[PDB]
RNA sequence: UGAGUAGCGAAAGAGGGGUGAGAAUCCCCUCCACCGAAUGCCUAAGGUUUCCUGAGGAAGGCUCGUCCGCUCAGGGUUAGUCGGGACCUAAGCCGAGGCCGAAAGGCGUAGGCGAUGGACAACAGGUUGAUAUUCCUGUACCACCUCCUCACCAUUUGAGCA
RNA sequence: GCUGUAAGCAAGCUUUGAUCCGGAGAUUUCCGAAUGGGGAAACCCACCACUCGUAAUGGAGUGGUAUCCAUAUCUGAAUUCAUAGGAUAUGAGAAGGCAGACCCGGGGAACUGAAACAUCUAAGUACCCGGAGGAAGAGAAAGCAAAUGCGAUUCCCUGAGUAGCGGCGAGCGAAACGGGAUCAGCCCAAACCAAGAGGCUUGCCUCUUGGGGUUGUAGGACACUCUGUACGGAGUUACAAAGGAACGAGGUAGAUGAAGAGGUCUGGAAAGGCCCGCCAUAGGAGGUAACAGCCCUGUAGUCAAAACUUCGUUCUCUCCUGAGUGGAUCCUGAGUACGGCGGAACACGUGAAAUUCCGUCGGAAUCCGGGAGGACCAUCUCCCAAGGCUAAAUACUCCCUAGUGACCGAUAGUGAACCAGUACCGUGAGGGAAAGGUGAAAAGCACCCCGGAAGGGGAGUGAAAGAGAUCCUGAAACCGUGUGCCU
């Protein structure tokens, strides 16, 4: 339901409460990248390219239902509504009625 | 692309495009045997652009009936 | 063998013996090969003898 | 249909194509169901360089394998085609 | 378990060098030995890439194994004249109509299929790591058709196809 | 956001609205009923028109070209008419399949029992073959039944394992009455009349078309009185067929959608303990880093389909008279019903055997008639066979949605949770397996050392690395290595 890129809290998990934006979404697997959240060291083969190989510092992406948007005003973790005249179903954030 | 094509006539266009879309397709299968013009998804423009033009023709036979 | 004016056929039944056992018998209906008027012209079909003893034209 | 253009598919660049192309004969695959005289329809009308001869082989497919999954190559049908003297060539260039 | 036991599938290799980490079993050379109306070549029945090159080598090789008919990655079969179909037919088969039979079908005429048969035009060299009476180099041959050239007829009291 | 498996690389495409999901099309090489012909399935070869191209042959595209039947039209043999037959065109005819089922019909066994077996049973079972339909079959009385009678068939329960049948043994075994589900009845044929045609000796009588006419204590014709041709009724499912067009409701896609990160603790992770707040026509389920009503998809309620449908109502359209009175006479189902012989189905095995249906012989009445009332006869009661249509009540599933299991949890459950009718086995019909789980995600082990390389040891990755490719748990047989005590 979340898209790239809205402002995003982390409900639960090891990173319970950090925030960041979305680098990429993966909707068929129901799983979303966030910057700097589930930051995981990965060992990589020396490529082709780059020749460095080494260790990378990426993020493995996060399941969608551990992610909420924010009110722009209160900054609260809020659930989602819809129905917006001339807005093509633009998200009513609860604690009505801010868009996006 | 359809509205760009029903305004095109049968004679003076389906001649000059499809045979030249062949000249875009068949010149590119030769390069697919070589690899010099890399640009690999230019094919899936061309063959798919053939496939929409050729069903306007067979549509107009129903429209001529 | 199945005739024309009616539906006489071979309705196979049992030969009930004395001190019945009893085996099987085909009962094909009576036939003669005679002229019968059809669409123009006759001839020829098998006939049934019940339909030929007084009936349509031989 | 049957056009000259869909009859051919490609040139086949092997070690054989090194020595034959210098001798005014060129390799081409053809479709599975296209005869010798349909090949002379191509090179005359696609390339504008007149055919000396058409010679057509056909191959069966090697039944390759990947893992458990075994299957057969599609069948190929090539054509060594000779051209006249005093007539150029319109290859990759 | 038997048990490190039976078996390792007839049949001479040996020596030097090389490869590689490793060699009796792989390659090369040189001696020797076997078949030689077959263990030679050519090509059917079949097989469907086992062919060639370049790498590997766990697995299949009745032992190793740098090797293979194993694995991969590419490459590999060129026909008017050769075999077969644009020809014909044999036993047989199928079979319009037809005849018999509860049904399904059984048989069969005219017809047609069906070589192991009959007819039938190409040959001698070269050639590659792989194809040849196909590629190629010289001759040829076979049938058909005429943008052409000549030769000879006859104009239905008619050349010719037949 | 997308380029399916597929986890990566290149090349690209998209809120000038893409990827996806539905409707409606178009496209759809070849084989296959294969249908121009041959064929050893996935290929060869034709011919007729038309096109492309070469000077031409050669070559290439586009359709058509089977067989049977039917409607016609030309021809039209021996043989004269004329026919067989031959030629042609027209048929959105039909041959094939498969839901391995259910339902009719034709054929149709055996093994088993009877403690043997041959009458019987098994059993009109399986199997083969023809039919199609979503259902089929049957059906408006020659029906039950014996009174104050019931009123088409079908299905269910009783009736009842009773009446019975049976080397009367094994075993077979009904009906009717009673109560429900479903609930509709009608056309043909025949006389009579009208129109044609077609012959005979005018006369006469013989085929079609159009009315009329549908029966039982008798109806129709015929005749005589009425009565309509509507505004009344019907109608595409029988009742006769057959058309459209509008209103509403489902289905093939959806869309909306309530309430908390409550705090703290344990932890790798809360969805868990404790202390707490809310929503609820929603606490069905399924994910969610671990057991969520409140995180997500959703759920409950509401609402929408441009296009296809399926259903219900209307309008349009279409079509249509019903009765009394009498009986001078004409009809009411012919080589048929019954009867002999021989069989079968009826629960009834040839019997005191009614009844049905077949083969083959005979063979009647046709209202003053005739048939049923378990041999047969009289009386009495029902009822008209010898023609046809008939939805629903019923049996079914390869199926498609939504759902439920005191069903299974990988030697179970389908044979198949896994690229299964695969691999293999067979010439061939056929037989026919095994094979689930890393982790919450690849974070799938960068780097160093040994090693040719697999294979390890450190290093990091994560909670675990003893978790690292049969990858959670890992038992036992087994195979080891150390051993304390005995030899």
From Swiss-Prot, chain A:
It is found in: Cytoplasm; Cytoplasm, Nucleoid. Gene3D superfamilies: 2.30.30.30. Keywords: Cytoplasm, DNA-binding, Ribonucleoprotein, Ribosomal protein, RNA-binding, rRNA-binding. Transmembrane segments: none annotated. Its main location: cytoplasm. CDD domains: KOW_RPL26 (cd06089). GO terms for biological process: translation. One of its GO terms (cellular component) is cytosolic large ribosomal subunit. PROSITE patterns: RIBOSOMAL_L24. One of its GO terms (molecular function) is structural constituent of ribosome. InterPro entries: KOW, Rib_uL2_dom2, Ribosomal_uL24, Ribosomal_uL24_CS, Ribosomal_uL24_KOW, Translation_prot_SH3-like_sf. Part of the 50S ribosomal subunit. Belongs to the universal ribosomal protein uL24 family. One of two assembly initiator proteins, it binds directly to the 5'-end of the 23S rRNA, where it nucleates assembly of the 50S subunit. This is Large ribosomal subunit protein uL24.
From Swiss-Prot, chain B:
GO terms for biological process: translation. The keyword Cell membrane does not apply. InterPro entries: Ribosomal_protein_uL29, Ribosomal_uL29, Ribosomal_uL29_CS, Ribosomal_uL29_sf. It holds the Pfam family Ribosomal_L29. GO terms for cellular component: cytosolic large ribosomal subunit. Belongs to the universal ribosomal protein uL29 family. Part of the 50S ribosomal subunit. This is Large ribosomal subunit protein uL29.
Swiss-Prot record, chain C:
It comes from the Bacteria. Keywords: Ribonucleoprotein, Ribosomal protein. One of its GO terms (cellular component) is ribosome. InterPro entries: Bacterial_rp_bL28 (IPR050096), Ribosomal_bL28 (IPR026569), Ribosomal_bL28/bL31-like_sf (IPR034704), Ribosomal_bL28_bact-type (IPR001383), Ribosomal_bL28_sf (IPR037147). One of its GO terms (molecular function) is structural constituent of ribosome. The keyword Magnesium does not apply. GO terms for biological process: translation. Signal peptide: none annotated. PANTHER family: 50S RIBOSOMAL PROTEIN L28, LARGE RIBOSOMAL SUBUNIT PROTEIN BL28A. Part of the 50S ribosomal subunit. Belongs to the bacterial ribosomal protein bL28 family. This is Large ribosomal subunit protein bL28. It comes from Bacillus subtilis (strain 168).
From Swiss-Prot, chain D:
Belongs to the universal ribosomal protein uL23 family. The keyword rRNA-binding applies. Signal peptide: none annotated. GO terms for biological process: translation. This is Large ribosomal subunit protein uL23. It comes from Bacillus subtilis (strain 168). InterPro entries: Nucleotide-bd_a/b_plait_sf (IPR012677), Ribosomal_uL23-like (IPR013025), Ribosomal_uL23/eL15/eS24_sf (IPR012678), Ribosomal_uL23_CS (IPR001014). GO terms for molecular function: rRNA binding; structural constituent of ribosome.
């Amino acid at each position: 339901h979340v898209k790239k890129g809205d402002k995003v809290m982390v409900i639960s998990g090891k990173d319970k409460g950090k925030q960041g934006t979305i680098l990429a979404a993966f909707p068929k697997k129901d799983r979303v990248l966030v910057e700097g959240v589930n930051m995981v060291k990965k060992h990589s083969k020396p490529t082709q390219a780059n020749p460095q190989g080494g260790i990378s510092n990426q993020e493995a992406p996060i399941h969608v239902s551990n992610v909420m948007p924010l009110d722009p005003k209160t900054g609260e973790v809020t659930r989602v509504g819809y129905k917006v005249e001339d807005g093509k179903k633009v998200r009513v954030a609860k604690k009505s009625g801010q868009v996006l | 692309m359809k509205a760009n094509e029903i305004r095109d006539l049968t004679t003076a266009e389906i001649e000059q495009k499809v045979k030249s879309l062949k000249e875009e397709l068949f010149n590119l299968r030769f390069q697919l045997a070589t690899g010099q013009l890399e640009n690999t998804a230019r094919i899936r423009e061309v063959r798919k652009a053939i496939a929409r033009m050729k069903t306007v023709i067979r549509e107009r036979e129903i429209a001529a009936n | 063998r199945k005739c024309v004016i009616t539906g006489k056929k071979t309705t196979a039944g049992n030969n009930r013996s004395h001190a019945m056992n009893a085996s099987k018998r085909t009962w094909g209906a009576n036939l003669q090969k005679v002229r019968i008027l059809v669409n123009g012209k006759p001839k020829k079909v098998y006939v049934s003898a019940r339909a030929l003893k007084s009936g349509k034209v031989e | 249909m049957k056009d000259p253009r869909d009859v051919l598919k490609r040139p086949v660049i092997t070690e054989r194509s090194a020595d034959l192309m210098t001798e005014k004969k060129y390799t081409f695959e053809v479709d599975v169901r296209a005869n010798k005289t349909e090949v002379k329809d191509a090179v005359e009308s696609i390339f504008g360089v007149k055919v000396d001869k058409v010679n057509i082989m056909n191959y069966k497919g090697k039944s390759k394998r990947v893992g458990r999954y075994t299957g057969m190559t599609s069948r190929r049908r090539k054509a060594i085609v000779k051209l006249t003297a005093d007539s150029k060539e319109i290859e990759i260039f």
